[PDB]
Amino acid sequence: DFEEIPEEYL
Amino acid sequence: IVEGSDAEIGMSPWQVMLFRKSPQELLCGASLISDRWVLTAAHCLLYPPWDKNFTENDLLVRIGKHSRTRYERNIEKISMLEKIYIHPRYNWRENLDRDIALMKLKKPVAFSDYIHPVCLPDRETAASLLQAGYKGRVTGWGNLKETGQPSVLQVVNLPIVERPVCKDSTRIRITDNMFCAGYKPDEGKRGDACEGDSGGPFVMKSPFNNRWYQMGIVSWGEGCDRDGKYGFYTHVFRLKKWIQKVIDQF
Amino acid sequence: ADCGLRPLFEKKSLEDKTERELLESYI
Ligand SMILES: CC[C@@H]1[C@@H]2[C@H](C(=O)N1Cc1ccc3c(c1)OCO3)[C@H](c1ccc(C(=N)N)cc1)N1CCC[C@@H]21
Ligand code: NA
Ligand code: NA
After folding, report:
1. Which of B39, B98, B162, B178 is most exposed by smallest CB count within 10 Å?
2. What is the set of domains in chain C, with CATH numbers?
3. Which one of 1.10.490.10, 2.40.10.10, 3.40.50.300, 2.60.40.420 gives the CATH number of domain B1-12+118-237?
4. Is the CB of B224 under 6 A from ligand 1?
C-alpha cells in the first residue's frame, strides 16, 4: 500500500 | 506501536523511515542525528539467521514523514545511503548485544519544520535520566498489534524498568548495553514497540535544558505489549564512543 | 548546537500533548 515515490529516488 | 496514539505534526522531527526500494516497504525506524548521519538498529540491516544483509543500494531513508504510506510532497525528503556502519561486536548470534548501526547520507538533508536532529546523551544526562520509573517516548510506523497498520506516525510514553525486573522477564542474557521499558501488569497502562518500529528512537526531554535526547534504540522483545514482558532498547550512551569514532573517522 | 529543539514546539514555546507526562516522571 505505499504510494509511488518519484522515480528520481529509485 | 501498540496502545499508543497519533503523533502531532512535527512532534518527532528526527524520525526516520527506512524504506526498501524493491519491494517497496517499511523496513524499520531510525533517527536523524545530524544533517548527514542516521542512527538505527544493527538488526535492521544485518541478521544472518533470517538471511538479512542489506547493502546501501537496497534502501532509502525518508525524513520529515507523518503519514505511513503516502508520498508527502513538499514535506518529506528522501535520501540515498553513502555508507552503512554496523557495530563490529554486534552479537546477532546470542542476544543482539550492541544493536546499533550508522548510515551516512550521500548528501546533507535540509532541516525544516518537519526535519530536525535529536541530541545524543553525554554521561551526565544518561546518569540523570536513565532511572527506573522515568518515562521516555517511542515512535514509529510499526504494527498496532502483535497479531493492523497505522495511517500516521504513532507515539507512546513508557517508563524505564528496573534491571532485575528486565532480567527476570526473559530467558535472554541481558547486557549493560540494553535497558528495558514498559508498564508492569499491575500498573494498568499499556504500550510497546512492535514489528516495524525496530531501529526507531526512545527519547527523553531533559528537564534541565529542555532538549530531547535519544537514550535508546528499539532493539527487541517477545511479542508486543504482552503482560510481564518489556521492550528492550539499545543503550545509546554506552555505545557513544563507537558512534563518535565512526563519525570522526568518516 | 540546535539539536533536540523542535521547530514546531520548543522553538515556538508550544508543548505537545503528552510531554508533561514525561516531566512528571522525572522526580
Ligand atoms: C532480528 C531480531 C528480531 C527483530 C526484533 C526482535 O525482537 N527480534 C527477535 C530476537 C530477539 C532477541 C534475540 C534475537 C532475535 O537473536 C538473539 O537475541 C523486533 C522487535 C520485536 C518486538 C519489540 C518489542 N515488543 N518492543 C521490539 C523489536 N522484531 C520485529 C521485526 C524484527 C524483529
Ligand atoms: Na532471566
Ligand atoms: Na508488557
Report:
1. B162
2. 1-27 (4.10.140.10)
3. 2.40.10.10
4. yes
